[PDB]
Structures are given as C-alpha cells and as structure tokens.
Amino acid sequence: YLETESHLRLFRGPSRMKPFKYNHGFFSHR
Amino acid sequence: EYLDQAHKQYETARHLPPPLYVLFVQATAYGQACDKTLSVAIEGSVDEAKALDDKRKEMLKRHPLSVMLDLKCKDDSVLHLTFYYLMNLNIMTVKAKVTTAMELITPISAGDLLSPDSVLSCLYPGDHGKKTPNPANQYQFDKVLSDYVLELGHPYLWVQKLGGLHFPIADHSLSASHMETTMKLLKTRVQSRLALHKQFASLEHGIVPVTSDCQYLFPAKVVSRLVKWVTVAHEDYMELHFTKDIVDAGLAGDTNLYYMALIERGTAKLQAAVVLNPGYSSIPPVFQLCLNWKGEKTNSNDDNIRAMEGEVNVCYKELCGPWPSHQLLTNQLQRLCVLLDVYLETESHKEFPQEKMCLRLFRGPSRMKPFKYNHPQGFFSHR
Amino acid sequence: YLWVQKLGGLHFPKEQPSHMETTMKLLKTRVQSRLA
Amino acid sequence: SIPIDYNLYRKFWSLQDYFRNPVQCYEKISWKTFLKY
Amino acid sequence: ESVEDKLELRRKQFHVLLSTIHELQQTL
Amino acid sequence: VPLAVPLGQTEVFQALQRLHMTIFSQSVSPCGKFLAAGNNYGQIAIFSLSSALSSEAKEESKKPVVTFQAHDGPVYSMVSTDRHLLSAGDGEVKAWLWAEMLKKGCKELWRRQPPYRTSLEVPEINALLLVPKENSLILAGGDCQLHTMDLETGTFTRVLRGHTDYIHCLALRERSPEVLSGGEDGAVRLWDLRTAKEVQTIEVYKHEECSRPHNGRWIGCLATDSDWMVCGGGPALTLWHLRSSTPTTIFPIRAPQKHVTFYQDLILSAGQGRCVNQWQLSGELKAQVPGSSPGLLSLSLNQQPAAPECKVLTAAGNSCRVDVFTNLGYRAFSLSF
C-alpha cells in the first residue's frame, strides 16, 4: 500500500484496486 | 554596402589553376544556391601567380595561390579548409582547422578528436589520408612521405573529386553532386566530433551524460558506475589478451580511436575496450568485455559475456535516437551498466540481491540470462 | 545567351579563365547578313 | 567411397616437390607457400 | 507598401550607380 | 592477418553479426549430400557437403548455397525425415522441403504450435525427437512438458508432466520405456509411450560420486546404447547402467559437456572447451582434437546410406563456422556460415 501508491499493473476494476495477492514471486490482484 | 568584391575575386580567380578555379566556381555556386552559411576566398600573391633535396622540394612545390573556404555550424563554431595545389603532381590537398567561439576547455581523453592531423580522415569509408591516388605519381616518385603529408596536407579522393580530377582535366559535372554530398558530410562530421568532445568532458568525471529523450531506454535505478575512461594506443589495444577477435576480423585498423572504460560494483571490475572509427554516428563503436570478478570470466570461457557484447554491438540501432544521433556511445555505456547489474543480480548461488522482475531465469541450450528491457511494463525478458 | 546578361549587368564566371554599342552593331550586321 | 581430404594431399605433395628441388626456396612467393604449407 | 517601393527604388538606383561605375571602370 | 577490411556500414554490420554468431542446431539431408545449420538469428544455412568434400573444390564452395530467414527467434532444434526438414524456432515448428529449399521459392509446408499454459513468455523448444515405428514427433522445452504430435495431421495427443524445470534433451532406445528426458531440474526421467506415465527417475546430483555443486544441477546431454546411458552437463560425465540406475564410471573432465553421443566403440563429447573429446568406454581419455570454435554445442555423425563419401563428423558452437572432420584426429576444413 505504501510503495504502489501513485504520487506489472497498478490498478484494475471500478474501485481502482491495488495488487494484494502474492505469487510465490510477484503481486497480482485478488 | 554598409547601408563589388565579386569582381575583385574574379580578377584574382583569373590566375587560379584549373582544378582550383573549378572548386572556386562550384563553391560560390553552392554557397549562393542553398547554403548561405559558407564563405570562400583566395589567399596568395598575384605576382607569383603571373610567373638531391632540392629536387624533392621542387617536386613538392605548392602553388602560390590557394583557396580557403569556411563553414559555420549551429554550434557557434566554424571549420576552415585551405586547399593547396601541387602542379608537379597534379594533386590538390587540404589543411583543416576547427575553431569554436568559446575557449574550448578540452579534457585529457579528447586528444585526436579535433587534432587537425586526423579530423577528416575517413569521411568516405577508408581513404586513409596517406597514399597518393593516381599510380602515375607513384611511378614518378619511384623515379626519385608522411612528413610531407603533415607539412602540406592530405591528398584525399573526395578533395580531388571536388577539384574535378578523375583518376581510374577538371570537370564541373563531376564536381556537381559530389559538392553537396561532401558538404553535408562535413557538416555532420564537425557536429559529431563536438558532441563527442562534450560527452568525453562529461565521461571523465565518472558521469554518463544521458538526455531527457533516451530515458525510456533504460531502467530508473542503476548501481554500477563508470570509474575510469582512458584513451589508449593501438599497440596497447593489441597487447590486450581479450581483443583477438576484433584484430583478426579486420576492425582494429590504424585509423581508429581506442579507449578503456572500467565499470565497477562491489568487488566487480569490468574492463571494456572501445574502438571508434572516425565515421561515428554512422558506424558504431565496437566493445570487448573482460569481467575480473571471480577468476577471469572473459569472452572465451563465458557465454553471457558474449551475450552482453551482442546486446551492445549488434543491437546498436535500438540505442540511436533522433536524426542527429550523436548520443550513441553514452547509450551503449548506460546499457552496458544495466547489463552488468543484470549479470550480477540474476546469477544463481549472495553479495548482490536480485531485485529484478525477470520471471524466468534461464532459457535455451546455452542457459541465457534475460538482457532485453521492456519499458511500458518495466521488466527484463530474453532476446 | 551570355551577351544578354552582359548587357543586363549580371557578370557570371566563364568556364575557362562599351558592350552595348558593339552588341547592337553585331545585331545590325546579323540582320543585314541574313536578309542578304 | 571413402571421404578424402584433398587439400592436405595437395599441400603435402607440393611440399614433397619443394623437397625434391631445394633451389626453389630462395624466391618470395615459393618461400611463402613453403611457410604456409 | 509605399516604404517598400521607396526602398526598392533606392536599391535599384544604387544598383544602377554600381553598374555605371562598372561600365566606367570597363571603359577606362 | 587482417585480410579483408570491411570499410562500409553494411559490411561492418555483417562482420559484427558474423563475429557474434552462435550455431545451435545441425541436420543432414536424406542423402548425404547436404547439411543444414540453424542460427542465432533465426536463419538457416544449407551446405553442399558433397561439393565441399569433392576433389574440385573452391574457396567459395565452403559457403551456404541457400541461406534464408526462417524463424523470428533463434533456431534451437532441427530434425530431418525421409522427405522433410522440421525446424523448431520461436515457439513453433515449421516444415521445409529438401527439394524446394534449394530452389528460389522456399515456402513452408505447415506451422504447428502446441497448447500452452498461456503465460506471457512464449516458451522455447529445446529438443526435437523424431520417433520411428509411428509417425510422431516429441516436443520439449520451456513448458516443462513433453508434447506428442502426429506427423500426418497436426493434432497433439499426449502431454507428459514430470519435470520441475525445463528440458534440454531427449533420447530413444527402442524398448518398453523407450524415451529418456533430461532437464534443468537435474533428473533423467523415463516415459513409457503406451501408458503415458513416468516409470523411472534417476537423480544424478543426489549421488555423491557425480555431484560437483559448483557448476550446479542441469543435465545437458543424454545418449543410449539400449542398455546404458551417458549423462552429462552440470554435475559430471557419467556412465549409468539402466535397469540398475547405478553410476558405473566417471569421465574425468572439468568443462561442462553440452553434447554426447555413441560412436562405434568410443564416446564423443563437446562442451565449453575448444576440443572434441574422445573417450573410451572404460573411462580413459583417448583423444582431444582441437576445433576452431571456443565452445561447441552440437556434433553430428553423417552416417547415411547411398552417400558413403559424405561420412564426416560435423561440429558447431559459439562461432559462425562449422568444423568438418574427415578423420578423427584433425580437422579437414571449416564451413563459414
């Protein structure tokens, strides 16, 4: 939440969701 | 005129030799036609124009009339050419001088960039500035030289095509197209050498000068830095053990500029020998790499070294930017810094943590590391 | 022609290194020669 | 048939011809071919 | 346009004076 | 020594591509007369091998008679049939005709791509195995899976899932298991084609006689004598006895070996070194013949009927040239790409 906040994809969906699912080694969306 | 001289120049040009007269007429025509940033003049004395070491001096007899043309470029700088003629040899030569408006504080490794012995050496591919063009003069000198080349000038082929001399009597039609092509090549050559001068003045301070346009070519964070940039000599280049392939391929000629870059990370040293031929921004510099990190990982005993050399040397057209692409050497050095970061972080076992998003570490029979950068998503893939 | 531009005032360099009265007299000779 | 290296054959028996006439090893071109072969 | 016509007339007069000087130098 | 100086942007660029060329694959024609070489840049050269081995031979005869761009990515594998040349490139296999690749047309027959996990990498195809007794072709690569394809119709029948990392090489020995496969995970696996299952696994890094943890665990090469196996790569060049899975002898060499094969009664090997390594089956280094490349990636015995004169050993690797051995003690010549 602190690193991916704007000043492989950063947002998706109507609520502009951040990627919080881990892949054992990158972050995707739920 | 403050609120003519052409008649005085015609009365002076009456006494010129015929190749020099053809050069004067075609230069005035090209200056009045397209490029008004050009000026010609005639330097000499009309009284002499009216008209066994002594045999060597009278054989290498300069005509008392010489022509002098200067160009100004869009860098508040000018190039001065003086064309001289040899009536005993039927060969005309050129002296050159690049002067800027500023003081031009030169760095150490600049050296032979703007040194007037070898500025215009390889406008066309080759020509060397050394040998006489017509073999009849070679047979005449065999009946009876580089010091006289430094004393008089360089007998190129393009200069004699400007004069009208056809070597398998001066011709304007032979001078016509060659005039515009060679003036465009001179305008590119001087701008390229001044841009290399600015880049070398920046690179001696350990900073790679990247422009605002090229920032998409590279990732943001870089760890490896340039600590040494020292021009070396030819024989010093051929004494290196890891540059046998450039020499055996025929790319390490005499008329080149040889440099040594040294790029480091934590206990990781990378020696990169650089060859420039004088046709820069049209022919890229060639690199050789030797990584003295653990043992001696060189081009013959490692394939990822050869992959980085392929990413720099063969794929150079990804690094050239706009039409005045004089930023190619800095883009190659920045990409090679990025490749050193990739080679050190993506190596399997930990002195260097892997922060890359490569998503696959090896592929292919040679077990290749990912060296291609992807900017809109920002990650490393394989070539 | 070259003499037209010499009368016009423009001076151009030739390939190898009172005009008015002479050109008009040469016109006078040329017309009489062609009619003859 | 059996595959044959003809280049080594030709260079080897040209060296044999150079052995049969030792006078020929004083020119330039013949000596250069002798060096290479 | 009047100022440009006056400047062009002055330039043509200067060119005619230069041509007359050239004709005088050629005759002498 | 610098005989040819390029002097020109196009020729300097061609010299740079030749200087940075790697030749991955080799294939032979149905007759002995032609050779096919795959390229780093996705190109294919065709070598008139009988014309190179002839008594009348010119310096321009050691050149490709037809070279052509064939794939977008590198050509990692070739194989040849009675009529076709199958070439695996970017992620798909193309087919070429030997009769038409010499001509000016150079069209492809088909273009088959196996089904994937839809990941965004487009994985490679490292090994092509051409299976007799049934028209089939086994694909293996970065998908970590063995695909079987019919040669007549482009349908994919079996998918085999045993490896953890990707596969480097395949083998064939004409018995009940009949398919060996070795990969980056470090285990030789046996694949019975009837049951489409894994029947035996030999982990070479687990055995302490073979381990060598400095280079890592990756199997680059396999070979079969229908009872034996030669496994090499990362760990060591080892001779395994099948049906026992016991390491019998070790071949004492430092450089990792990228390719191995059985000769009449020798073992031929090539790797990161310069020379071709000739071993005896007991484990004694019989010979080392130096090649022209700094490293080699492929050997090929051209043992084809109806052309006994084209019986040579061809070697290729990290160079733009192919070493041709007419005898096993010295190189005869080399074919430039």
Tab-separated table of N, CA, C and O in Angstrom, chain B residues 152-187:
chain	number	residue	atom	x	y	z
B	152	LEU	N	52.159	19.463	-45.795
B	152	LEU	CA	51.378	20.019	-46.893
B	152	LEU	C	49.877	19.825	-46.728
B	152	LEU	O	49.106	20.758	-46.977
B	153	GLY	N	49.442	18.639	-46.330
B	153	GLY	CA	48.043	18.312	-46.208
B	153	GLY	C	47.787	16.900	-46.664
B	153	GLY	O	48.711	16.140	-46.975
B	154	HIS	N	46.522	16.540	-46.725
B	154	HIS	CA	46.169	15.174	-47.053
B	154	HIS	C	45.567	15.087	-48.450
B	154	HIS	O	44.585	15.773	-48.746
B	155	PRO	N	46.131	14.262	-49.321
B	155	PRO	CA	45.543	14.051	-50.660
B	155	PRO	C	44.422	13.010	-50.669
B	155	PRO	O	44.595	11.839	-51.002
B	156	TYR	N	43.219	13.448	-50.304
B	156	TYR	CA	42.085	12.540	-50.277
B	156	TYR	C	41.542	12.295	-51.681
B	156	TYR	O	42.007	12.870	-52.665
B	157	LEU	N	40.524	11.437	-51.755
B	157	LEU	CA	39.842	11.216	-53.025
B	157	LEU	C	38.709	12.213	-53.220
B	157	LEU	O	38.461	12.669	-54.345
B	158	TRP	N	38.003	12.551	-52.138
B	158	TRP	CA	36.868	13.453	-52.253
B	158	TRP	C	37.305	14.875	-52.572
B	158	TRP	O	36.584	15.595	-53.268
B	159	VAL	N	38.496	15.271	-52.113
B	159	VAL	CA	39.034	16.589	-52.443
B	159	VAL	C	39.301	16.688	-53.938
B	159	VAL	O	38.986	17.694	-54.585
B	160	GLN	N	39.843	15.624	-54.515
B	160	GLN	CA	40.153	15.635	-55.934
B	160	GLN	C	38.900	15.471	-56.778
B	160	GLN	O	38.875	15.913	-57.930
B	161	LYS	N	37.856	14.850	-56.235
B	161	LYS	CA	36.575	14.866	-56.936
B	161	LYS	C	35.940	16.249	-56.875
B	161	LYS	O	35.197	16.637	-57.781
B	162	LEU	N	36.203	16.998	-55.799
B	162	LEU	CA	35.771	18.395	-55.763
B	162	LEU	C	36.532	19.226	-56.784
B	162	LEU	O	35.971	20.152	-57.383
B	163	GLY	N	37.813	18.918	-56.986
B	163	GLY	CA	38.589	19.647	-57.972
B	163	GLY	C	38.234	19.289	-59.401
B	163	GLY	O	38.460	20.081	-60.318
B	164	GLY	N	37.680	18.102	-59.615
B	164	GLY	CA	37.300	17.632	-60.931
B	164	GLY	C	38.203	16.556	-61.489
B	164	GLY	O	37.971	16.086	-62.613
B	165	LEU	N	39.223	16.149	-60.747
B	165	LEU	CA	40.171	15.166	-61.247
B	165	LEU	C	39.581	13.767	-61.160
B	165	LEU	O	39.170	13.319	-60.087
B	166	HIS	N	39.543	13.069	-62.293
B	166	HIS	CA	39.015	11.713	-62.369
B	166	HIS	C	40.173	10.746	-62.531
B	166	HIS	O	40.818	10.713	-63.583
B	167	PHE	N	40.440	9.961	-61.492
B	167	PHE	CA	41.533	9.012	-61.509
B	167	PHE	C	40.983	7.593	-61.496
B	167	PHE	O	40.361	7.183	-60.504
B	168	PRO	N	41.178	6.810	-62.568
B	168	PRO	CA	40.657	5.440	-62.645
B	168	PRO	C	41.428	4.466	-61.760
B	168	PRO	O	42.599	4.718	-61.477
B	169	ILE	N	42.139	16.684	-66.233
B	169	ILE	CA	41.259	17.712	-66.772
B	169	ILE	C	40.023	17.853	-65.890
B	169	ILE	O	39.275	16.896	-65.692
B	170	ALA	N	39.815	19.058	-65.368
B	170	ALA	CA	38.756	19.285	-64.392
B	170	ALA	C	37.394	19.372	-65.067
B	170	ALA	O	37.264	19.913	-66.169
B	171	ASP	N	36.371	18.842	-64.395
B	171	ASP	CA	35.009	18.816	-64.908
B	171	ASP	C	34.056	19.357	-63.853
B	171	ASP	O	34.122	18.952	-62.691
B	172	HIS	N	33.169	20.266	-64.265
B	172	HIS	CA	32.160	20.785	-63.348
B	172	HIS	C	31.078	19.752	-63.064
B	172	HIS	O	30.546	19.698	-61.942
B	173	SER	N	30.740	18.932	-64.060
B	173	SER	CA	29.704	17.924	-63.883
B	173	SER	C	30.151	16.831	-62.925
B	173	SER	O	29.328	16.231	-62.225
B	174	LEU	N	31.457	16.564	-62.877
B	174	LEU	CA	31.980	15.635	-61.881
B	174	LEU	C	31.964	16.267	-60.494
B	174	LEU	O	31.809	15.570	-59.487
B	175	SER	N	32.114	17.591	-60.426
B	175	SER	CA	32.120	18.280	-59.145
B	175	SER	C	30.719	18.483	-58.577
B	175	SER	O	30.592	18.676	-57.363
B	176	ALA	N	29.686	18.391	-59.424
B	176	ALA	CA	28.347	18.890	-59.099
B	176	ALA	C	27.706	18.186	-57.900
B	176	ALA	O	27.452	18.810	-56.867
B	177	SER	N	27.438	16.885	-58.014
B	177	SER	CA	26.739	16.179	-56.940
B	177	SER	C	27.652	15.914	-55.750
B	177	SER	O	27.210	15.953	-54.584
B	178	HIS	N	28.928	15.648	-56.046
B	178	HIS	CA	29.932	15.399	-55.019
B	178	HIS	C	30.105	16.596	-54.105
B	178	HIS	O	30.392	16.419	-52.915
B	179	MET	N	29.891	17.813	-54.628
B	179	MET	CA	29.927	19.019	-53.812
B	179	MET	C	28.920	18.960	-52.671
B	179	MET	O	29.305	19.043	-51.500
B	180	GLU	N	27.639	18.769	-52.993
B	180	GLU	CA	26.597	18.799	-51.968
B	180	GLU	C	26.733	17.631	-50.999
B	180	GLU	O	26.562	17.813	-49.783
B	181	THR	N	27.086	16.444	-51.510
B	181	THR	CA	27.239	15.292	-50.622
B	181	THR	C	28.390	15.485	-49.642
B	181	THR	O	28.237	15.245	-48.438
B	182	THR	N	29.540	15.975	-50.125
B	182	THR	CA	30.667	16.175	-49.221
B	182	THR	C	30.443	17.328	-48.253
B	182	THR	O	30.926	17.261	-47.120
B	183	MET	N	29.699	18.371	-48.643
B	183	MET	CA	29.443	19.447	-47.685
B	183	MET	C	28.492	18.991	-46.587
B	183	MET	O	28.668	19.358	-45.415
B	184	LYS	N	27.501	18.156	-46.938
B	184	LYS	CA	26.654	17.556	-45.905
B	184	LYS	C	27.458	16.648	-44.978
B	184	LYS	O	27.245	16.646	-43.759
B	185	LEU	N	28.415	15.894	-45.534
B	185	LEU	CA	29.220	15.008	-44.695
B	185	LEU	C	30.147	15.787	-43.770
B	185	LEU	O	30.372	15.376	-42.628
B	186	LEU	N	30.673	16.921	-44.235
B	186	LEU	CA	31.498	17.763	-43.372
B	186	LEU	C	30.674	18.381	-42.248
B	186	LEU	O	31.133	18.454	-41.094
B	187	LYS	N	29.454	18.826	-42.575
B	187	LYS	CA	28.572	19.401	-41.568
B	187	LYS	C	28.172	18.372	-40.516
B	187	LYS	O	28.029	18.719	-39.338
